Amino acid sequence: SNKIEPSLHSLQKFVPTDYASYTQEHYRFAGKEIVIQESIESYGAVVWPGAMALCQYLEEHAEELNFQDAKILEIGAGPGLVSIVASILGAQVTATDLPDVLGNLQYNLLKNTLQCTAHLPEVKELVWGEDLDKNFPKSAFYYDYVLASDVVYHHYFLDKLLTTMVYLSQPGTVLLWANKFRFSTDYEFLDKFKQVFDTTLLAEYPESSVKLFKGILKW
Amino acid sequence: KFVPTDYASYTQEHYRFAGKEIVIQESIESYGAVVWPGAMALCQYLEEHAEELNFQDAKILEIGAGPGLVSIVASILGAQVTATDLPDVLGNLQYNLLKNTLQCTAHLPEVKELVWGEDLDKNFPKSAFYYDYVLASDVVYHHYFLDKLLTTMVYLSQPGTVLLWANKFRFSTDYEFLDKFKQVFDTTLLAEYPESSVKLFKGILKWD
Amino acid sequence: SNKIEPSLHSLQKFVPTDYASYTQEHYRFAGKEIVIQESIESYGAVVWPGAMALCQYLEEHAEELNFQDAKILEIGAGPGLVSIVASILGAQVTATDLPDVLGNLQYNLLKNTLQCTAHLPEVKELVWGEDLDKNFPKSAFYYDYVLASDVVYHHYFLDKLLTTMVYLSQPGTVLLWANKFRFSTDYEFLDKFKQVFDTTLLAEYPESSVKLFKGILKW
Amino acid sequence: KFVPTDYASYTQEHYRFAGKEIVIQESIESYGAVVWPGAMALCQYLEEHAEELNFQDAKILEIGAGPGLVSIVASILGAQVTATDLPDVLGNLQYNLLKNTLQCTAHLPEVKELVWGEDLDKNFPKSAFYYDYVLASDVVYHHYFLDKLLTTMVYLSQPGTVLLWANKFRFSTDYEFLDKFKQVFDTTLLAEYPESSVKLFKGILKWD
Ligand SMILES: Nc1ncnc2c1ncn2[C@@H]1O[C@H](CSCC[C@H](N)C(=O)O)[C@@H](O)[C@H]1O
Ligand SMILES: Nc1ncnc2c1ncn2[C@@H]1O[C@H](CSCC[C@H](N)C(=O)O)[C@@H](O)[C@H]1O
Numbered sequence: 001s002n003k004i005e006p007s008l009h010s011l012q013k014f015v016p017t018d019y020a021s022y023t024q025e026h027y028r029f030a031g032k033e034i035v036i037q038e039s040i041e042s043y044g045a046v047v048w049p050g051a052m053a054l055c056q057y058l059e060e061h062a063e064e065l066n067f068q069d070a071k072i073l074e075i076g077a078g079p080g081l082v083s084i085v086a087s088i089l090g091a092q093v094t095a096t097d098l099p100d101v102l103g104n105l106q107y108n109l110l111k112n113t114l115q116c117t118a119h120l121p122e123v124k125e126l127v128w129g130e131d132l133d134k135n136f137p138k139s140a141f142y143y144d145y146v147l148a149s150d151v152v153y154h155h156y157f158l159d160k161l162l163t164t165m166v167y168l169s170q171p172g173t174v175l176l177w178a179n180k181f182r183f184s185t186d187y188e189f190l191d192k193f194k195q196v197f198d199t200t201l202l203a204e205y206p207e208s209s210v211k212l213f214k215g216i217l218k219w
Numbered sequence: 220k221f222v223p224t225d226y227a228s229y230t231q232e233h234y235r236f237a238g239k240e241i242v243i244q245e246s247i248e249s250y251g252a253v254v255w256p257g258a259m260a261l262c263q264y265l266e267e268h269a270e271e272l273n274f275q276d277a278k279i280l281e282i283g284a285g286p287g288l289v290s291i292v293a294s295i296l297g298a299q300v301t302a303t304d305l306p307d308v309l310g311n312l313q314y315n316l317l318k319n320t321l322q323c324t325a326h327l328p329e330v331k332e333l334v335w336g337e338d339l340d341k342n343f344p345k346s347a348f349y350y351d352y353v354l355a356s357d358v359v360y361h362h363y364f365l366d367k368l369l370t371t372m373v374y375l376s377q378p379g380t381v382l383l384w385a386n387k388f389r390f391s392t393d394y395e396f397l398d399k400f401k402q403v404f405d406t407t408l409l410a411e412y413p414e415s416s417v418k419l420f421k422g423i424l425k426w427d
Numbered sequence: 428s429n430k431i432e433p434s435l436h437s438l439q440k441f442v443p444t445d446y447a448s449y450t451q452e453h454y455r456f457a458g459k460e461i462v463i464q465e466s467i468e469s470y471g472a473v474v475w476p477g478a479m480a481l482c483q484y485l486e487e488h489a490e491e492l493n494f495q496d497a498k499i500l501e502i503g504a505g506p507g508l509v510s511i512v513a514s515i516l517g518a519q520v521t522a523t524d525l526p527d528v529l530g531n532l533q534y535n536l537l538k539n540t541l542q543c544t545a546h547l548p549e550v551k552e553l554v555w556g557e558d559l560d561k562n563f564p565k566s567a568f569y570y571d572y573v574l575a576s577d578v579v580y581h582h583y584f585l586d587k588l589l590t591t592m593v594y595l596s597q598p599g600t601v602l603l604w605a606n607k608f609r610f611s612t613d614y615e616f617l618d619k620f621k622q623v624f625d626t627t628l629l630a631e632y633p634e635s636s637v638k639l640f641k642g643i644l645k646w
Numbered sequence: 647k648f649v650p651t652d653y654a655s656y657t658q659e660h661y662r663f664a665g666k667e668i669v670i671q672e673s674i675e676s677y678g679a680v681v682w683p684g685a686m687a688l689c690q691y692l693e694e695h696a697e698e699l700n701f702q703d704a705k706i707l708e709i710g711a712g713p714g715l716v717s718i719v720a721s722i723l724g725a726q727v728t729a730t731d732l733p734d735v736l737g738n739l740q741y742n743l744l745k746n747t748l749q750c751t752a753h754l755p756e757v758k759e760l761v762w763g764e765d766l767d768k769n770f771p772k773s774a775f776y777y778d779y780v781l782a783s784d785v786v787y788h789h790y791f792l793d794k795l796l797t798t799m800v801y802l803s804q805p806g807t808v809l810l811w812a813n814k815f816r817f818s819t820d821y822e823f824l825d826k827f828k829q830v831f832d833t834t835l836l837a838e839y840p841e842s843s844v845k846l847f848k849g850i851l852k853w854d
């Protein structure tokens with residue numbers, strides 16, 4: 001092969017990124033300046049408001065959440081801001097999404113965490129409702145925390161989303177889900193979520209119509 | 220003319236729609252020589268809704284027709300069908316379309332080149348080409364012609380034209396395309412199959 | 428695999444591009460607006476003055492050069508502007524460079540030629556002086572034209588460069604080489620080039636200290 | 647402490663420099679557990695130029711020392727050597743360095759963590775760490791620490807310090823690094839091996 005940054009090899013195994021359209025966007029969380037490649041004006045991944053909210057919550061509740069060495073999975077990670085912040089806070093982070101997102105997700109993770117966080121993040125395809133037992137078998141993959149931000153949108157496969165949330169929530173797992181409430185379907189999803197998860201409203205961000213929920217699975 | 224691309228990997232695949240047993244020559248070496256999940260769902264819809272749609276004698280254009288199953292089904296149902304794709308796809312498209320429609324549908328279907336967003340005014344002038352329906356299946360995926368695709372869909376959508384678009388949803392970009400489609404078309408979800416991640420939409424061009 | 432633009436699969440097989448540093452630069456040659464990803468301020472490939480000069484020559488001498496269906500190889504192609512222009516003019520273009528250049532080279536070629544030129548360009552590693560018989564055997568790879576722009580720079584392996592130029596110049600092959608004359612080593616290389624190639628000065632670009640040479644191999 | 651990374655793929659590789667037969671434990675699973683072409687060329691240079699360089703009792707730091715061949719050779723030649731790398735590389739680096747220098751060179755070499763550009767003021771204060779030579783081999787390649795690398799080279803280059811840097815040239819970025827190195831160091835090409843694409847430079851920090 002070529003003598004390159006070894007992390008770049010995993011990047012080469014994802015769908016390529018249409019980078020002409022992507023620009024460097026700057027954030028600051030958990031004491032660090034963060035740079036995210038996003039495609040704001042054309043096709044490609046972007047940071048959503050739910051991410052901004054969840055990142056604020058994580059930086060502010062870091063001591064309580066005890067992310068140091070926690071095993072974390074993010075569903076619908078997008079460009080990766082939340083997974084980056086979780087990694088800065090010391091978690092073992094697996095960031096997941098659809099195949100066209102994974103390259104830029106991995107790139108963003110590398111650019112913000114390589115040799116400067118406790119654990120190198122992992123990037124993996126996870127299509128909601130598909131191949132869960134095959135790729136994320138409960139018996140081999142317990143997560144202390146499952147993160148999700150702005151994964152509820154009317155055109156997504158939302159029962160597959162709920163099924164995935166449930167699948168990844170074992171006894172002890174804490175699910176942190178932030179969303180902007182844009183449409184009636186979002187409200188309807190919250191009612192479905194509350195039926196199966198013991199649900200707590202942790203924070204409200206009225207300025208962005210974002211709410212942050214904790215879900216632990218009812219026994 | 221059109222001659223099929225000379226693949227050594229052609230297979231004869233067997234389908235049944237609108238009451239006819241249909242054979243489609245396919246090759247995995249080209250997306251356009253493969254029947255995709257959107258095609259199956261759209262064929263099932265056309266077969267089940269033929270009465271409502273009044274395809275009898277309707278003028279229809281299919282974009283990205285690939286191996287031609289949807290165009291065959293539309294011809295079987297009595298439409299005047301124009302099947303379009305990239306120049307290299309046309310040979311096998313015409314072969315399949317003719318094998319399945321010659322002397323057995325109401326109207327012989329036509330095959331024409333239509334590269335998305337290229338020379339639409341010159342190749343398909345509105346002064347002479349009006350479609351009652353535009354059909355599209357599995358044309359949205361992670362490729363570099365998404366804007367040109369939407370432009371083409373808009374172009375072919377004169378007032379009165381109905382667009383029927385089926386697609387498997389695979390990529391973040393597919394959802395972005397859907398959002399852009401809804402900005403320009405009054406959109407109705409006709410059917411959804413979460414197991415196969417397929418949606419089928421009607422689009423009517425917005426004027427307001 | 429994934430249902431993606433099929434050209435993107437070849438892109439995934441090259442060293443990844445550090446795209447945060449790359450910006451879209453605009454050129455106009457051979458009647459077309461061209462967009463090139465370049466890394467001007469940091470590590471990554473850029474367009475050199477020799478490219479600008481050679482592109483001007485190609486657009487202006489298109490009829491004479493008869494690039495339609497010509498088999499062309501570019502050595503040290505960089506971000507790919509020259510190979511793009513050659514492809515627009517109708518040539519079968521093989522663009523070559525060191526492994527860290529090939530991804531962005533291929534990307535630039537795709538963004539400017541996919542479904543809009545006569546022949547899809549090829550991208551291949553070609554390290555000067557290495558693996559020539561193995562990867563570009565004269566008996567299977569005859570080129571009508573070999574292109575090179577600003578490939579002469581003092582810190583490169585310039586005898587390996589000359590050896591490569593010679594290797595790729597069969598009877599009938601026309602070598603078009605543009606360079607800015609920056610250093611004494613550049614002048615010295617020109618003297619070496621003239622010793623082995625029948626050399627003609629085709630054009631001088633005094634405004635950028637660029638000269639464009641034709642070389643045909645002495646028999 | 648430092649313990650070698652637990653690879654199942656360690657091999658015992660055999661070198662001869664400065665008159666000693668040297669054994670280096672290597673693993674292809676880490677760049678830092680492999681001897682690279684720059685190392686060989688730099689060792690050959692140090693062996694051939696030892697008289698001129700007055701390494702006897704010289705204080706020397708190696709950055710990116712990897713499996714430690716260059717540091718071993720420098721110790722053999724009588725220098726006080728500090729070998730540095732990433733924390734995961736240090737175990738095998740110390741193992742090799744000790745196996746080859748314990749009770750048989752003038753000065754026992756030291757192994758210390760030095761992640762390029764990280765906490766240099768805190769970990770290697772100038773108030774207490776002056777190197778007569780800084781050594782580096784094959785530390786330039788297509789990685790995301792090139793600026794930090796150069797910063798580190800500059801940091802360790804106090805007035806009087808000589809930097810010796812050997813490298814295989816593989817990538818366009820390697821040449822860009824060389825251009826940036828020459829902006830900040832008065833640079834001399836000590837040796838060049840086109841067949842193996844290796845160059846060896848001396849750098850002295852510029853003040854003018
Ligand atoms: N069925 C599915 N499987 C996996 N991911 C999906 C999905 N449907 C949508 N997604 C992903 O969910 C994300 C929603 S957008 C939110 C992105 C990110 N969490 C942020 O807040 O910035 C997108 O990245 C999208 O690709
Ligand atoms: N830029 C472009 N212009 C015209 N057709 C294109 C195109 N890009 C892709 N296509 C065509 O779109 C099709 C996508 S695959 C879908 C084929 C068929 N509709 C089915 O569902 O089975 C291929 O036939 C491909 O050749």
Ligand SMILES: Nc1ncnc2c1ncn2[C@@H]1O[C@H](CSCC[C@H](N)C(=O)O)[C@@H](O)[C@H]1O
Nearest residue numbers: 474475478503504505525554555576577818
């Ligand atoms: N030994 C070698 N083998 C292959 N390419 C080399 C090389 N040494 C340098 N190069 C390449 O030669 C190019 C010189 S810069 C010129 C780039 C381009 N032709 C333009 O004019 O814009 C770089 O892309 C560099 O990576």
Ligand SMILES: Nc1ncnc2c1ncn2[C@@H]1O[C@H](CSCC[C@H](N)C(=O)O)[C@@H](O)[C@H]1O
Nearest residue numbers: 678681682685710711712761762783784791
């Ligand atoms: N950011 C960083 N800080 C410190 N060392 C680094 C580094 N990035 C890479 N390295 C080290 O640089 C070395 C490059 S390989 C060269 C090893 C040795 N000098 C030889 O020539 O054989 C590896 O040991 C690697 O661990």
